[PDB]
Ligand binder design. Structure first.
Ligand SMILES: Nc1ncnc2c1ncn2[C@@H]1O[C@H](COP(=O)(O)OP(=O)(O)OP(O)(O)=S)[C@@H](O)[C@H]1O
Ligand SMILES: Nc1ncnc2c1ncn2[C@@H]1O[C@H](COP(=O)(O)OP(=O)(O)OP(O)(O)=S)[C@@H](O)[C@H]1O
Ligand SMILES: Nc1ncnc2c1ncn2[C@@H]1O[C@H](COP(=O)(O)OP(=O)(O)O)[C@@H](O)[C@H]1O
Ligand SMILES: [Mg+2]
Lengths: 568, 573, 91
């Protein structure tokens, strides 16, 4: 026949017990049996994003036909999995696909309506050459064929809803993606098959950790595909750890290994203030506020519909604004430059706002994405830095209203960007003169009140109502910026060790470097670039001059007005 | 058995020693054994490259099966390969190849989990059997995948996987991407040390280990079509057959690195490089002797080996007006270092003043004007990793370039918006500017070169970043030439004119007085050498081509370019 | 005309056949480099287009061959002119 060539008998495979114990999905099998028992249009199409187990639903339907959990219109049926990829194989000659397809339809008609057909990837029927829709389509309309289709939602609305006739011949049985507990029940149903295949043991905290962590930390796949992937890959890794040269129980540590590759952080976050003062000295209040935000987010108490950090940095520039934020992105998730910096001096127009959100449909910057939205859609776990937010056009803060209240922002191309795993940081200088001229012997709370009054005279009442906490950034004294210069000398010594040199200094040279470009009105960054220029010009010039040798004592001795490098 | 008819056994050929021993690739075989010992997504497909040992991993897996180094689950498994044209031997009837293949698949199902089948060129098996009223191979094996009756192992390229296996659904969810990286230089050394004894016992010659490491390094440096380690194996075996011919035709057996150089150039460095550099500069880039010394110092400090090899050699910002030898210097560096005239990339920064600067030049995330075209810089260096990079007219740049340029000036390697790494450590990055060129045209006369360079570096510190110009090797001052250098460059242009006329069949020698009339009538201090070019064109070629077509100047005579009162006339004698 | 390659292409991965191939670079890049079932049975002997002077030598030998057919006297300026002008003007 032609059914033997192109179809796979799923009820014969269920009779041989080769299918899976499909546990769950009972409403969708009831809905499919509601569609497969009509008089015309007996054709359910299963619809859901890939991985949600639609072939699993049809395998469960075949097992219920075998056992007898179906009504008296489905006992003794045969579920035959038709292969659309196997009929369009020899597509050379005229009328070579139509003879195959007509042979399958005549053999399904010979069985007197006793065969349910199953076409997975039903969108392959539309593009087959006219071809495959137009021959099935009269038999589908009159209920003479019981085609259980199965296709992805996006492929369905791209290929089948485009064609209103073939869309009429099918009924949508929406296969929704399962919850976390349902994945746990599936994996407890499928645990015995893996433990009798791999011949290992599986522990139930590893199962619930697989379901929870794949649900939480993977946005590509969907449950229960990714959870079964984690369990099977971990079981194979334990199988090769046994069978090479020693546990057999899969643990949640194995699940974390497979998730990270393919909870001492609590004790780290208890000393998160120490970690933030490892790299930025001074400014205890901002470190306390940011660490409070991190502790509230990681402890599970904060609002899950708001971003983690929503703060307004004030004060003069270069006092440790971006150094704190780079250290925060380093010790939060990954790295110093695993963050997003946006120079808000660029944005002073209306098309500036359309740049940082995205141009609407039909205009120039449409396909190019947004600016903020692309940077967060690429890095959903990152830190956002709005550098000098006072320079922005006064309607960027409406975009920021949506950002800081909801954690969502819809770009020009109509897709939502989730900000609920990031930290928004806005640096400004709206009260630099007022805090620099009144830093002396004034407290923190009244200074916050005064600069908050000034900022409230600057900003809109809706926007300052959204901010979580407004820190002050008091100016640093001479010893604070001197200690900053000491830390910069330490990281410069680290960079010289990376270059491969051991260079010492005198304390008089340290005082001259600390007093080259010291200015409280411009920050430590003029002092930083003064030290960096006055070291990287003469020392690296003497490197190119052929003087420095790796493995010699090099002291930064002082000149009358300069610093000389010696070779001892 | 139909297996004994037209299949190929790898375990038998590994047990009988007919297969090459495989050394290395333990991580890839380990991940392949991770993939094979699953219950879902059983079948691996080895995504690799044409010539990186995709067949070698399955050969080494068969050797570990025969040697018993495998885990207990894979012991006793007979790895077979599948041969197409062997199965299309005597099958011309109506469905005879399909019947033979169906019998092979029924015999593989009869083995019941015993045969781990290897299918090289898996996409080719998907698209093989263009038959007459019958089936192909891929859609007759495809029901045997999703019935648990096949333990396939595949091999393909990344592009053929992305086209022919990622597009399908069940073909995607039966297969795993065991990605096979291209091996390193020392990996190639280890592999060539593995198979040296077989080639020596075949070709009756001897192979030396410095020749092996030289073959590996020069194959990694020079050859771009093939890849490691197959190109190095081809070099070794081609040198072996060359030594065998030298025995046969007209008495050595030791393959040295000189033999490898003979084969490879047929397919002493630093000092001669310095001499050829400083000699071929004055052939092409005449004048600018301070610049010749500056470029010579830069090349000595680069190829001395005392600097950092994690940085690109080209790190330069240039100064001077149009037509001062900048492009001449770029093409001279290309013709010297890379053995080709057009061995460079010429892009001008005069038009990237907007936000489409990094996305046009460097690399575009999906949606830009430079996205459906490839890319201007990173994709061009993907085309030419052995080349020179030019950034002309840098005074019209954009601030989201300087960060990319600091990445080049610090580390060289560069990741564009698409997420691929393009390295610049074998390229020569060149930038040109013309801001301080007014003082150079103004007062180069009666002044020196060092104080001029210091004052124009002060002007750069007025205009540009003092920290961005630190990683630049040397910023040059291009000035001036009055009589003898004008005579030399006019002699160059006259040389190419003499080449065209001698291909026509004429012999023209310029007189000194006519060249003085060209130097007076063609040169001016305000412009440079372009009025010399158009004056050469007009005052020489237009009356000369007026005269040649006139039936006047007979071939084969010395044509002295004499002078008129103000013109330049050609004479016959 | 199964016709020839399914009785020859097996013998290439059988050692009984020692064939010598000749094809265009484009037909090689289409019909052989894709056909990876036979790729390590070949080596790309890239016959470069000859230069002008190699063509002049080829034309001197074939001058000696061609003058006995047309019964004329091909001249050596005609050889060097044909090489130079055919290299320039016929792309
Ligand atoms: N309710 C369920 N009971 C048992 N196994 C399930 C269930 N849902 C999913 N699975 C398993 O999850 C995996 C998903 O396979 P599929 O059914 O192909 O997934 P899908 O939802 O059909 O999406 P695609 O496009 O087919 S990958 C299989 O191994 C199924 O056995
Ligand atoms: N410094 C120089 N020394 C000697 N000859 C020079 C010098 N600068 C220019 N020339 C000559 O003048 C010509 C001017 O052409 P180019 O240098 O190519 O002009 P350009 O400014 O580089 O722009 P293009 O795109 O190359 S036309 C050169 O080809 C040389 O023949
Ligand atoms: N480590 C190795 N040990 C033995 N042989 C090797 C090794 N690496 C490469 N080879 C040889 O180089 C060839 C290249 O293999 P492969 O990349 O599979 O070619 P292709 O990609 O064209 O199928 C192999 O046939 C093998 O004989
Ligand atoms: Mg499916």
């Amino acid at each position: 026949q032609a059914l033997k060539k192109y179809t796979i008998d799923l009820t014969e495979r269920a009779e041989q017990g080769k299918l899976d114990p499909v546990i769950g999905r009972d409403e969708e099998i009831r809905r499919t049996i509601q569609v497969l028992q009509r008089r015309t249009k007996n054709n359910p199409v299963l619809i859901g994003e890939p991985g949600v187990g639609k072939t699993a639903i049809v395998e469960g339907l075949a097992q219920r036909i075998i056992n007898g959990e179906v009504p008296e219109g489905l006992k003794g049926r045969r579920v035959l999995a038709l292969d659309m990829g196997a009929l369009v194989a020899g597509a050379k000659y005229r009328g070579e696909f139509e003879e195959r397809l007509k042979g399958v339809l005549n053999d399904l008609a010979k069985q007197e309506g006793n065969v349910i057909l199953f076409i997975d990837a039903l969108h392959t029927m539309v593009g087959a050459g006219m071809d495959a829709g137009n021959m099935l389509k009269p038999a589908l309309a009159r209920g003479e064929l019981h085609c259980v289709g199965a296709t992805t939602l996006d492929e369905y609305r791209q290929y089948i809803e485009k064609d209103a006739a073939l869309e009429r011949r099918f009924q949508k049985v929406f296969v929704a993606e399962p919850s976390v507990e349902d994945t746990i029940a599936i994996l407890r149903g499928l645990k015995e098959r893996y433990e009798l295949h791999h011949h290992v043991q599986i522990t139930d905290p590893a199962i619930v950790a697989a379901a929870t962590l794949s649900h939480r930390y993977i946005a590509d796949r969907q449950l229960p595909d990714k959870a079964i992937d984690l369990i099977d890959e971990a079981a194979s890794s334990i199988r090769m750890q046994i069978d090479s040269k020693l546990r057999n129980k899969v643990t949640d540590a194995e699940i974390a290994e497979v998730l990270a590759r393919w909870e001492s952080e609590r004790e780290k976050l208890l000393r998160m203030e120490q970690e933030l003062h490892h790299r930025v000295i001074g400014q205890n209040e901002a470190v306390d506020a940011v660490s409070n935000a991190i502790r509230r987010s990681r402890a599970g108490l904060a609002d899950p519909n708001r971003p983690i950090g929503s703060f307004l940095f004030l004060g003069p520039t270069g006092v440790g604004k971006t150094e704190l934020c780079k250290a925060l992105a380093n010790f939060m998730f990954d790295s110093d430059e695993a963050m997003v910096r946006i120079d808000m001096s660029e944005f002073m127009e209306k098309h500036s706002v359309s740049r940082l959100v995205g141009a609407p449909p039909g205009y120039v910057g449409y396909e190019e994405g947004g600016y903020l939205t692309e940077a967060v859609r690429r890095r959903p776990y990152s830190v956002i830095l709005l550098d000098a937010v006072e320079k922005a056009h006064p309607d960027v803060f409406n975009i920021l209203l949506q950002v800081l209240d909801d954690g969502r922002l819809t770009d020009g191309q109509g897709r939502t960007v989730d900000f609920r795993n990031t930290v928004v940081i806005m640096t400004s200088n709206l009260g630099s003169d007022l805090i620099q001229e009144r830093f002396g012997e004034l407290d923190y709370a009244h200074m916050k009140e005064l600069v908050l009054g000034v900022v409230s005279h600057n900003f809109r009442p809706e926007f300052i109502n959204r901010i979580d906490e407004v820190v002050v950034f008091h100016p640093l004294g001479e010893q604070h910026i001197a200690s900053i210069a000491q830390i910069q000398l330490k990281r410069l010594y680290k960079r010289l060790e990376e270059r491969g040199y051991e260079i010492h200094i005198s304390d008089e040279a340290l005082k001259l470097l600390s007093e080259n470009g010291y200015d409280p009105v411009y920050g430590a960054r003029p002092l930083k670039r003064a030290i960096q220029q006055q070291i990287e010009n003469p020392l690296a010039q003497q490197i190119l001059s052929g003087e420095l040798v790796p493995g010699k004592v090099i002291r930064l001795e002082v000149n009358e007005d300069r610093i000389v490098a010696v070779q001892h």
